[PDB]
Amino acid sequence: VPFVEDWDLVQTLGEGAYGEVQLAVNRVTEEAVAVKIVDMKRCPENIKKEICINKMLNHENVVKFYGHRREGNIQYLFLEYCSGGELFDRIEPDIGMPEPDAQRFFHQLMAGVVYLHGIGITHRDIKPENLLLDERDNLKISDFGLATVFRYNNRERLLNKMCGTLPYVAPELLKRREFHAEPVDVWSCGIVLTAMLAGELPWDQPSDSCQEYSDWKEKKTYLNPWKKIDSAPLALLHKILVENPSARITIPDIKKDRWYNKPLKKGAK
Numbered sequence: 001v002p003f004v005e006d007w008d009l010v011q012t013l014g015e016g017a018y019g020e021v022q023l024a025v026n027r028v029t030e031e032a033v034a035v036k037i038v039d040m041k042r043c044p045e046n047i048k049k050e051i052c053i054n055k056m057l058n059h060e061n062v063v064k065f066y067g068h069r070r071e072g073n074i075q076y077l078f079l080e081y082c083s084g085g086e087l088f089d090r091i092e093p094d095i096g097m098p099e100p101d102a103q104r105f106f107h108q109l110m111a112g113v114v115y116l117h118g119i120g121i122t123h124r125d126i127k128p129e130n131l132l133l134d135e136r137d138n139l140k141i142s143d144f145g146l147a148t149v150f151r152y153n154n155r156e157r158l159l160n161k162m163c164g165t166l167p168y169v170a171p172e173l174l175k176r177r178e179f180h181a182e183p184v185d186v187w188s189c190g191i192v193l194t195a196m197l198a199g200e201l202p203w204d205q206p207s208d209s210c211q212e213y214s215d216w217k218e219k220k221t222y223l224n225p226w227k228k229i230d231s232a233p234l235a236l237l238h239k240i241l242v243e244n245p246s247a248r249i250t251i252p253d254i255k256k257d258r259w260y261n262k263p264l265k266k267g268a269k
């Protein structure tokens with residue numbers, strides 16, 4: 001058993017356009033889970049898609065989906081709780097974080113992205129606010145509200161929907177009518193890596209009109225944020241933040257990168 005199906009809402013984890021995320025604790029087991037609550041009266045289609053995609057997810061670096069409950073016009077998505085909070089909060093403004101910590105988070109982010117791409121899913125909005133940490137500081141990708149299928153029955157479909165978050169979005173999304181999904185998620189991962197190592201975002205958007213983006217294209221790496229980044233991870237960023245998505249490094253090649261494979265001091269937590 002009796003009561004095992006009861007959950008107590010104990011605290012608000014966050015509030016935003018998606019609704020709110022609360023921490024819930026099981027009345028009997030004390031198991032902690034996150035609950036995304038949405039007033040479907042203010043979706044029903046978006047919600048269904050998010051649930052359908054969540055149902056496909058089973059990986060250690062992706063927030064797990066436990067199920068959902070519909071109480072009238074309120075939808076309840078039960079998700080894996082990540083007590084370590086958002087990666088965003090581990091990034092010190094203007095500083096970033098220690099390189100070994102950034103590398104470990106990057107390895108884990110890559111593992112989650114490889115998994116998603118392997119099942120034909122693109123996240124479309126990778127950024128530190130959406131990357132969560134568990135009790136051992138293991139990274140988990142969250143928020144599949146913009147996620148979509150880019151490969152089905154072994155055939156790729158090109159994307160055309162402009163979406164994401166400007167400082168993280170790849171340049172082809174702003175310039176081209178259609179584009180491949182994978183390089184767009186690679187690019188945002190490179191912006192996340194830059195933020196972790198420098199504590200700042202390099203540009204407002206990767207447009208010709210953006211001076212900071214122009215400076216990067218001109219290899220002015222003596223300027224911030226680049227100047228703050230050691231040569232080895234900077235060499236990886238030179239391969240990721242490549243304007244032409246067809247020339248941009250792919251994940252299998254990121255896995256062969258020198259910095260990616262450099263032993264640094266960091267363990268779980």
Ligand SMILES: O=C(Nc1ccccc1N1CCNCC1)c1csc(-n2ncc3ccccc32)n1
Pocket residue numbers: 013014018021034036063079080081082083084085086129130131132142143144145
């Ligand atoms: O799936 C989750 N969230 C989630 C699911 C769907 C849309 C948005 C979110 N959030 C919004 C706030 N930033 C993170 C993504 C989720 C699973 S655990 C969790 N947790 N855990 C700790 C925590 C602290 C702040 C915000 C969310 C948090 N959130």
